Design a protein around this ligand. Structure first.
Ligand SMILES: C[C@H](NC(=O)CCC(=O)c1cccs1)c1cccnc1
Length: 279
């Protein structure tokens, strides 16, 4: 399948070269997979989600996304127009308040929630979790991300936006999950993207158009935006049968575009997520 005039990041993940605007993907589109978006919530009523999104957990007085960030990330995973995996099921877990903040204990509870809650959902092709959040290093946060991965969920986490080594941030620094840096439309590392040996992959992260609250759309930037490209890619590849939750990060790294990004520090991988789709 082909989606013309797609957001540049969707085109980029299905291309061997920058500078194109059509997204190419197998029409299965992540059907039968599930992606949890652990964030500020999801505006599930947005027409772009087509009834495929639902809130399953909140730690606050409401499950509504009063911020927009979670809705934007969910849109990059799986919205009809802005999403990688246009037929996946999306599950929202609100661990961040409407200011985008949350304590580590709540984030840990949300990860352990997903590890259990996946057993209440129908996800025959596999389960992914997208974590576009982070803070300073915490062994407890890293352990929670490691548990979620071990339970059979492909965990994708943002590297962070400090132009610094991601080893000092969590859950970015957990080795067993998939840590995602950000690139721009000219194949440069995004200026704010963290780096380091703990990174596994880069995805599009600068000027990413996706869904927003109020039934709207907007373009924003961050490793938060790169992470759901990788999460949606994992769901898409799992539906195709090419990989599993335990192996998807390695598979994405194996099949990535290699050596194409500029301003990658020595010792950080030069790997850009790629769906390897041949129409
Ligand atoms: C993730 C980032 N802001 C945070 O304050 C970190 C949230 C978090 O996990 C914390 C780590 C240490 C104290 S709290 C963010 C994400 C989305 C929207 N706006 C901001």
């Amino acid at each position: 399948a082909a989606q013309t005039n797609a957001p540049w990041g969707l085109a980029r993940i299905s291309s061997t070269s920058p500078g194109t605007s059509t997204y190419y993907y197998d029409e299965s589109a992540g059907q039968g997979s599930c992606v949890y978006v652990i964030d500020t919530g999801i505006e599930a009523s947005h027409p772009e989600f087509e009834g495929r999104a639902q809130m399953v957990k909140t730690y606050y007085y409401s499950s509504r996304d009063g911020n927009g960030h979670g809705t934007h990330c969910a849109g990059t995973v799986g919205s009809r127009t802005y999403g990688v995996a246009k037929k996946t099921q999306l599950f929202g877990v609100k661990v961040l308040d409407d200011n985008g903040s949350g304590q580590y204990s709540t984030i840990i509870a949300g990860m352990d929630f997903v590890a259990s809650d996946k057993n209440n959902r129908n996800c025959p092709k596999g389960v992914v979790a997208s974590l576009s959040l982070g803070g300073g290093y915490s062994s407890s946060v890293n352990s929670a991300a490691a548990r979620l991965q071990s339970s059979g969920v492909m965990v994708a986490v943002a590297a962070g936006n400090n132009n610094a080594d991601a080893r000092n941030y969590s859950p970015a620094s957990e080795p067993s999950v998939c840590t995602v840096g950000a690139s721009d439309r000219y194949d440069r590392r995004s200026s704010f993207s963290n780096y380091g040996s703990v990174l596994d992959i880069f995805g599009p992260g600068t000027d990413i158009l996706s869904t927003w609250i109020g039934g709207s759309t907007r373009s924003i930037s961050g490793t938060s935006m790169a992470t759901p490209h990788v999460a949606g890619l994992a769901a898409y590849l799992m539906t195709l049968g090419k990989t599993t939750a335990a192996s998807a990060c390695r598979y994405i790294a194996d099949t990535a575009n290699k050596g194409d990004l500029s301003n990658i520090p020595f010792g950080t991988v030069n790997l850009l997520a790629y769906n390897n789709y041949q129409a």
